Design a protein around this ligand. Structure first.
Ligand code: HEM
Ligand code: HEM
Ligand code: HEM
Ligand code: FE
Ligand code: FE
Ligand code: FE
Ligand code: FE
Ligand code: FE
Ligand code: FE
Ligand code: FE
Ligand code: FE
Ligand code: FE
Ligand code: FE
Ligand code: FE
Ligand code: FE
Ligand code: FE
Ligand code: FE
Ligand code: FE
Ligand code: FE
Ligand code: FE
Ligand code: FE
Ligand code: FE
Ligand code: FE
Ligand code: FE
Ligand code: FE
Lengths: 159, 159, 159, 159, 159, 159, 159, 159, 159, 159, 159
């Protein structure tokens, strides 16, 4: 069904934002695993896979509106080199994603494309829940110090 | 463990190659679904997920060798606009991936990095199996014509 | 609870639109079965029953707002006499339904009747998914020809 | 138990005929798989394995009669390069096998070796059932054309 | 995918070598059964079936590389007329098969055909395990004498 | 149904031959048990019971053809006084039974009594399988010596 | 596969003989049920259904030999008007069927059509077993009188 | 099968290396348990048992190649007297084992002993995974301090 | 808890004696397997694993008494080159182990270290049971001859 | 049975020592629970209940020897007011208990009362295992500091 | 293994003592059953069977030490003619057995035969438990009188 061009442009911007998050969180998952924080690595793997589902929803909506999904490029990755930098890098990215979806939802609403608007609002609520998770981890790091926070999430040793 | 820099560079080249395949095949999956060939869409989804596991293997080996995995960029995507063009696009990409892994394996072998060499040779055998699959689909299209080939894989209607 | 008169008028227009779809798709289901396309008949039966649930949601919301649901009349039915005409007839109807719900949602939003607005937006997303299904069937008919498309969905013979 | 020399010669001719069929049908199975006709490849694999059991019955009967089974050589293989040539090649081979078993059964009957006669007659009935299968596939190819016949047996894509 | 011609020639040599082993061991299985050593007959049947899987692996790789598998001929069969001669015959054949796969692996490695090299090296390790088995049986025959060795493996009488 | 007199005479000769085998093998079963070869005793018990079923088939066919089955007399029993004599005695008897059934089958075939002919041919195949078993036991005795052969079949001691 | 014309003529005569038996025994089944002999009605129903399988085997063999099965006509039916006449009528028919299959088997054997010969011989053994059943029922009627024989097979009353 | 003497010498060197690791890690397991770090003791027990399987693989390959496995001596043990020293001691040993297997694999490859080369390369990849584990523990000790790292792995108290 | 120095010296001598037995019996297990005596190989594997548990008990008791377990060295290994030499070599070793534990138990008793005394006495009873097993195998070899003894324990062939 | 008076006196001293341990460890269990270290409280409860079984064994042995068990008095309790004092208090008590059982065992042995001697030696081994546990907890407190040690054993909060 | 002669003499004295107890308690079991005290008969049967296991342990230890177990003779039996005499007779025997095992254990300990010493001490503890049972029954008889004691153990009547 032919969609509004500008809504499709917002969908493609959101697709790029998710593709960035998928790779940033996957590499952070593998970094946390390499540093030994297996329980943080678990959660980051799961979070990357949630971003993969978001990416796929934008691909599907762009095609239905007869647009061309563009997976060629990512936004710049922010890669942390301590557990606190990983938290701060992902928080920054998620704040940008939330602001993009807020704008995409408002634009879609303005042209009557209510299903695209509900897609952006659903994604904006999901990224606010991830923001809430990341802010809570940074709150623990500030109250306990980074070492006590990270040590609690080393996890169990593999059989 | 500090790795050979040039093996790490081959690993990062392979990581980019897999990231490209993941997105090329995922978009092709969603295209085949949008066109209505649900049985080809199923297989392409599964193939993209196999490429995601390959990508993750390169990330893990790069970090173990104390390199920096680079997920920022992809090789150029080849996007097909008919079922035959999707087959041809993916075959071309997999041929490049196979040659890169052949080279990577021989290079690692030359510096005694036998685990990295075995990672490349395992991936090169997996990409040859995908090349086998794609050449067989193209063989069917040449013997039956594209319409008879595609129509067999429309699949079932969703409940 | 006394509702906005004009929102109730949009709900009653939507009820008529669904009642039309229920009968158009049921008769098309029975036509596809009589022509022998049992797998298309299955999907059309299911689609008619999904429209019956939509009809019932408008009846329930109209009564809660103390309006009088009017089931006396349908919009004009569009009845196809080939598999391609069935697809085109249902697509045309669904485009009109989607535009009505877009308008109903915007009107309800303008008077603060957010539950009626969410009902129209939920229905507008559901009819866009049916539009997507119908457009995909027409895409197959254009790429393969009507005979190859229909033959794939003849289905199995009854015991 | 010492058998009739000439019956043992017919058993050894039958062993060679089965060993030929085993390899002809196995290579055709793998050819049909490489061309993409997975449901024809399935049936040819099974047919080759049925010929393997026939081969083994001749080995066992030759030893019991104190002869020397000769597995060194095959009859000339007939290898098809299209689905129709595969059908015609196997049909030709099976006609020759049936005529050999007819003759072997009659010869064994003439010398009172009724168990060897029943072995040849059992095998001759089994090869007539395969002849019936192959002739039916060629009947479909002549009534529908090779493309419609082969396309129906492409099968499902591997997980 | 077009393969190196000389690797395809090594693959076809290996195919002939396996076809020879399948028939040598199947006939030896049936000989051991006819002589009454049912436990040696069981193992030889199982070993012949392992060789059948090896044969099939060469057929599949030859077709993938667009070569023509040749099942027409076998290498000369070595048929033993005592349990010790069966052991010696099969050991001699497996030594030749091992040397052929060693050569085939080194050749494929030299042209970068790493999947074919891994197929040869996998087969060469499997034939070394069979060489280990056969040398162990010959060791028992030399330490205990052939009659004590063979008598232990008569097995049970059929119901 | 009135049968051919001479076919009934062959059936009655076969009945006497089976009744002889039943008692010869039962007494040999009990002799092998008394000597201690419990696993040979098991097989001989089972073989006697297979001969009992053969005897019963001749009784049933003779009555259906309105003849008088004669169970009054046996052929002379051959009773072995070592394990090798038991094998040789039963082999001699079974060779005579096989020759009788060969002749009975040919005679019945000559008068069109195809069901009696198939009964004799079925029995002739079954006695050839017993001949094969007995010859194999004598082959073991000649290759290993009687003591090693018999000792392997002493069996387990009763609880 | 083109069969011998005269064997196909014997197969078509056998098809007519079975089609006669199917209807004669079905009507006798329903007559015995109407007279009240429910246990004889059960057996006759089952016997008719066994004749239906025989009929189908002749249809299948005639088509495989590229003949034209003729189901248009039956041999004259013999319908009994007492339980003893039913037994005598079916016995007469079965004697004629047995003689036909004897002749068909001998003719097929004479032209080497061993699978058709085995079909006739299998059917001739099956009709001899039915002859045996019918003769036994007439033996009971002669020893006990028709009333005691029939009364024992009245059966149970329907719920 | 007679092996290359120098490959057998590399195998015996590897056997000594594994015997050393088995005892170093078993004693470290029992030390960690005595100090109270029950979760580190669990993993070290499991790692020592993995080294026992490696040792056994060298024994088996040495005997197959007709060499004499030498279990008499170990390389010098490095025993740690703090949790950090145990990590450092085991890392140093595994680095030596990895270099030995790299050398052994390259040497075997040079003489065509591909099964022994694959044994060394498999072991070299397993020791690299253990090196990865030990480097990660040392990374945690450097980022958190030894007391926080060790305290997380005290484990549970025994019932 | 600080132990008696001399008791710890006896514990460390016992640890060396067990470490010797573990490797002597493991290599003998693998030798018996390579010679083909699979049922003797099974028992020797199990016996080596029982010695591994003894070794571990000495490690644990030495640490609890604040001594330093020494795993660096073994006593000289005695490696047999026939089944009888394997039995005699292990018997000699076990006699030395039993005498050591007798002495260790008496010494520990003399200094009141009753738990170490009970450890030595438990181990001395376990090694007497192994002495009993080994002497019984040598008794069989002397009464039956080595060939009949070893042949009974060849075992079953691997699937 | 009348026992040795002095052995009964040692049994009664041991009964008093166990009764002291039961109450010291039960009160420490309840103290650790009141301070919040639920996982240390669990282990101390279990340890007190193990001491209750020891107490009961002395009661039973004293009565069998016709002595009078005296439960009226305890040795002085040592009650800790920090987690480290609890560990040190219980360690001191257990050292005294171990020395008493060592002496009781030696005395009983001197008068031939071997069952009482084995009771004391069994108890002395059990108290050495508790000494080992307590020393390990104090080792953790010295390596990690009391706070990190105790915090790891706070446990879970009650539902 | 050659044992100490005098320890073997003590083992043989213990074997005689157990063989006496087995028969004394079995006859008392059967006497108590004949008098009607079925619950005392149950316990005496079980006690005799416990003595049978003791007897067997002495047989096994005597043979392992290469002595000759002597089962030819018993010590004099003490057979009671009232329930109280049965208790007193068995108590007297068990006191003698306990004193013998005390002496045997001390002697074995003096020559370092610690496994024989532990066998005697285990048996001495088991006979003290039986002494305890018998003394308790005599205590009941003295406190309640023989009639009330015996009547409580008459038991239930057999079905
Ligand atoms: C186009 C970008 C991607 C999309 C649209 C995508 C989509 C998906 C989806 C939808 C799934 C779950 C599939 C299911 O559960 O049925 C999945 C799984 C997974 N993806 Fe991705 N993915 C993408 C990129 C990546 C990247 C860049 C990696 C790692 C480098 C990755 C690694 C994985 C893995 C390992 C799984 C399966 C995990 C498991 O089975 O536990 N994906 N992906
Ligand atoms: C002497 C010639 C051969 C004989 C007598 C023979 C006999 C047999 C028999 C009797 C079986 C089934 C065994 C069972 O189910 O227990 C079997 C299985 C098989 N054979 Fe053969 N075979 C022969 C040649 C071949 C050839 C030439 C190939 C392929 C190149 C082949 C591939 C196989 C495979 C793959 C199986 C097992 C299939 C499965 O498990 O699904 N065989 N063969
Ligand atoms: C320090 C010397 C050793 C000690 C203390 C030791 C200890 C152990 C223990 C306690 C087990 C059983 C573990 C369980 O069942 O949870 C075990 C298993 C085993 N050990 Fe050892 N071991 C030692 C040396 C060896 C040697 C030298 C080898 C072979 C060369 C060996 C091969 C094995 C194997 C293969 C297993 C597992 C067997 C199975 O799972 O069936 N061990 N070892
Ligand atoms: Fe997202
Ligand atoms: Fe997010
Ligand atoms: Fe890949
Ligand atoms: Fe791929
Ligand atoms: Fe609707
Ligand atoms: Fe709709
Ligand atoms: Fe065949
Ligand atoms: Fe065939
Ligand atoms: Fe092979
Ligand atoms: Fe092989
Ligand atoms: Fe018979
Ligand atoms: Fe027979
Ligand atoms: Fe019939
Ligand atoms: Fe019939
Ligand atoms: Fe290792
Ligand atoms: Fe390791
Ligand atoms: Fe030991
Ligand atoms: Fe031992
Ligand atoms: Fe205690
Ligand atoms: Fe304690
Ligand atoms: Fe006793
Ligand atoms: Fe007793």
């Amino acid at each position: 069904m032919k969609g509004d061009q500008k809504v499709i442009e917002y969908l493609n911007r959101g697709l790029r934002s998710e593709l960035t998050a998928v790779s940033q969180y996957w590499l952070h998952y593998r970094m946390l695993e390499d540093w030994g924080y297996k329980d943080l690595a678990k959660k980051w793997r799961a979070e990357s896979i949630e971003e993969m589902a978001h990416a796929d929803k934008f691909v599907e909506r762009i095609l239905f509106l007869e647009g061309l999904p563009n997976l060629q490029t990512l936004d710049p990755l922010r890669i942390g080199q301590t557990v606190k930098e990983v938290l701060e890098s992902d928080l920054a990215a998620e704040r940008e994603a939330r602001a993009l979806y807020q704008e995409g939802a408002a634009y879609a609403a303005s042209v009557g494309d209510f299903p695209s608007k509900n897609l952006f609002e659903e994604l904006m609520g999901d990224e606010e829940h991830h923001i809430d998770f990341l802010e809570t981890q940074l709150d623990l790091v500030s109250k306990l110090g980074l070492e006590l926070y990270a040590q609690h999430h080393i996890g169990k040793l593999d059989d």
